[PDB]
Amino acid sequence: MQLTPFLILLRKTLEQLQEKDTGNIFSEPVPLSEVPDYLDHIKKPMDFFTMKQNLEAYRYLNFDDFEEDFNLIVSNCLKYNAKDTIFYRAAVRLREQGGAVLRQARRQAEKM
Ligand SMILES: O=c1[nH]c(=S)[nH]c2[nH]c(=S)[nH]c12
């Protein structure tokens, strides 16, 4: 397939995923200055802003590498936060609502 339409599709998909994060709590890296223990067991932080930087740096050339970093946004949050927190429930909801978005986007990609 051709590169430019694939990237235009990942851009749209990333926008749709960000739309599901209505609190915008995954829009930027977790502020280590406010969460000084975050990197103790989170070995690769991830967020939507960095996903955008990776997209435009041509770091996502297939749907799996894009989806892998989205999954990190979710899994890091589930790992760090207790189950009874807003953070944890937000990651569960993002996993649920993001899953449909990714499935449809991958179908569009496989037609290419
Ligand atoms: O998962 C989190 N993501 C962010 S951006 N900030 C923050 N603070 C605590 S505590 N947990 C989290």
Q: What is the DSSP string of 25-57?
A: TTSS---TTT-TTGGGT-SS---HHHHHHHHHT
Contact 45, 39 (CB under 8 A): yes
Token pair of 101, please?
A: 């978005």
Atom of ligand 1 nearest to the CA of 87: 1
Ligand 1 atom, smallest distance to 47 CA: 5
| CA-to-CA separations, 110 to 54, 62, 86, 104, in angstroms, rounded | 21, 10, 35, 10
Distance CA(13)–CA(30), nearest Å, equals 22
CA of 32 from ligand 1 middle (Å) equals 9
Which one of 2.70.70.10, 1.20.920.10, 1.10.357.10, 1.10.4080.10 gives the CATH number of domain 1-112?
1.20.920.10
Pocket test for ligand 1, best of 24, 25, 95 (most atoms within 8 A of CB): 25
Instruction: Look at the alpha carbons of 32, 37, 43, 45 in this order and tell me if their dihedral is positive or negative.
Output: negative
Documented resolution in Å: 1.7
DSSP assignment letter at 62: S
